[PDB]
């Protein structure tokens, strides 16, 4: 990972320009972002990933760091993504699940 600002996280697995994609989260995704301090309705993807990461850690969905698995089956995030769990290493898979929950500007 890289952290180009205090509210963004990027990855070499995804093109840099893709992480600058402007998006308008649908209501559930937006709710999760605002629960950890987000104050707007439009974001770059790298900001969405930052806030989703904060949400995951705040809800204690990634306690076992070395296992690299988020367990979200009983959380809003599991409903958002439509999976019971996923790997924090699989960044394209994560981007794909997020894209289903937003409109691209
Ligand atoms: C790809 O290979 C690896 C990946 C990893 N780990 C990751 O890629 C996970 C990552 C470091 C980036 C990992 C990340 C970062 C940028 C983009 C993407 Cl798609 C993923 C990122 C993350 C953020 C949001 C979501 Cl929804 C998610 F599932 C995972 N998170 C966040 C923490 S954070 O990076 O935001 C930090 C607080 C440390 C700045 C954790 C809470 C979910 C990570 O911890 C570890 C080891 C290896 C290896 O084999 O060497």
From Swiss-Prot:
PTM (free text): Phosphorylated at multiple sites near the RING domain by ATM upon DNA damage; this promotes its ubiquitination and degradation, preventing p53/TP53 degradation.
Every SWIB/MDM2 domain range: 21-104
Location of region: Sufficient to promote the mitochondrial pathway of apoptosis: 1-96
Subcellular localization: Nucleus, Nucleoplasm; Cytoplasm; Nucleus, Nucleolus; Nucleus
Chain residue ranges for the region called Necessary for interaction with USP2: 1-105
Induction, as annotated: By DNA damage.
Expression sites by tissue: Ubiquitous. Isoform Mdm2-A, isoform Mdm2-B, isoform Mdm2-C, isoform Mdm2-D, isoform Mdm2-E, isoform Mdm2-F and isoform Mdm2-G are observed in a range of cancers but absent in normal tissues.
Disorder association: Seems to be amplified in certain tumors (including soft tissue sarcomas, osteosarcomas and gliomas). A higher frequency of splice variants lacking p53 binding domain sequences was found in late-stage and high-grade ovarian and bladder carcinomas. Four of the splice variants show loss of p53 binding.
UniProt domain comment: Region I is sufficient for binding p53 and inhibiting its G1 arrest and apoptosis functions. It also binds p73 and E2F1. Region II contains most of a central acidic region required for interaction with ribosomal protein L5 and a putative C4-type zinc finger. The RING finger domain which coordinates two molecules of zinc interacts specifically with RNA whether or not zinc is present and mediates the heterooligomerization with MDM4. It is also essential for its ubiquitin ligase E3 activity toward p53 and itself.
Role: E3 ubiquitin-protein ligase that mediates ubiquitination of p53/TP53, leading to its degradation by the proteasome. Inhibits p53/TP53- and p73/TP73-mediated cell cycle arrest and apoptosis by binding its transcriptional activation domain. Also acts as a ubiquitin ligase E3 toward itself and ARRB1. Permits the nuclear export of p53/TP53. Promotes proteasome-dependent ubiquitin-independent degradation of retinoblastoma RB1 protein. Inhibits DAXX-mediated apoptosis by inducing its ubiquitination and degradation. Component of the TRIM28/KAP1-MDM2-p53/TP53 complex involved in stabilizing p53/TP53.
Quaternary data: Interacts with p53/TP53, TP73/p73, RBL5 and RP11. Binds specifically to RNA. Can interact with RB1, E1A-associated protein EP300 and the E2F1 transcription factor. Forms a ternary complex with p53/TP53 and WWOX. Interacts with CDKN2AIP, RFWD3, USP7, PYHIN1, and RBBP6. Interacts with ARRB1 and ARRB2. Interacts with PSMA3. Found in a trimeric complex with MDM2, MDM4 and USP2. Interacts with USP2 (via N-terminus and C-terminus). Interacts with MDM4. Part of a complex with MDM2, DAXX, RASSF1 and USP7. Part of a complex with DAXX, MDM2 and USP7. Interacts directly with DAXX and USP7.
Family affiliation: Belongs to the MDM2/MDM4 family.
Note: MDM2 RING finger mutations that failed to ubiquitinate p53 in vitro did not target p53 for degradation when expressed in cells.
Protein name: E3 ubiquitin-protein ligase Mdm2
Native source organism of the sequence: Homo sapiens (Human)
This protein's encoding gene: MDM2
Complete-protein stretch covered: 6 to 110 of 491
